[PDB]
Amino acid sequence: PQITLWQRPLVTIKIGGQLKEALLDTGADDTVLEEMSLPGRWKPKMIGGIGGFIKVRQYDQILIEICGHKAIGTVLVGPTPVNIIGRNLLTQIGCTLNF
């Protein structure tokens, strides 16, 4: 699909059996979701953005579906104010910026 940017590019995603709303963020290296449980081992990580850093749990090899497109990748879980789909998964669904 072609997503305009007049409004925030919010999409529904499916992960760990849950449907969630997430922001497609080309300015995010990683995908960060609000607190939730995920399977497998995880390791701590510190990620930053506007306002500073937050500590998150890093899970690898997580399956996610965004607009019918299935992807596999690392997913960070922590006190993020919004669910964010970063470049690590945007590439997998073939998402590009165009103008």
Ligand X SMILES: CC(C)(C)OC(=O)N[C@@H](Cc1ccccc1)[C@@H](O)CN[C@@H](Cc1ccccc1)C(=O)N[C@@H](CCC(N)=O)C(=O)N[C@@H](Cc1ccccc1)C(N)=O
Hey, is 89 helix, strand or coil?
helix
Instruction: Confirm or reject binding of residue 33 to ligand X (CB under 6 A).
Output: no
Region near its own copies per CB under 8 A, out of 13-21, 35-43, 44-52, 57-65: 44-52
C-alpha to C-alpha distance for 96 and 78, rounded to whole angstroms: 26
CA-to-CA separations, 35 to 25, 39, 75, 78, 83, in angstroms, rounded: 18, 13, 11, 5, 9
* Residue 74 near residue 43 (C-beta atoms within 8 A): no
Instruction: Confirm or reject binding of residue 25 to its own copies (CB under 8 A).
Output: yes
Instruction: Confirm or reject binding of residue 84 to ligand X (CB under 6 A).
Output: yes
Residue matched to tokens 């760990």: 16
Q: How far is the CB of 40 from ligand X (least distance, A)?
A: 19
Q: Which residues bind ligand X (CB under 6 A)?
A: 23, 25, 27-30, 32, 47-50, 81-82, 84, 86
Q: Which residues bind its own copies (CB under 8 A)?
A: 1-6, 8-9, 23-29, 32, 47-54, 67, 69, 80-81, 84, 87, 90-91, 93-99
Query: Which residues are the active-site residues?
Result: 25
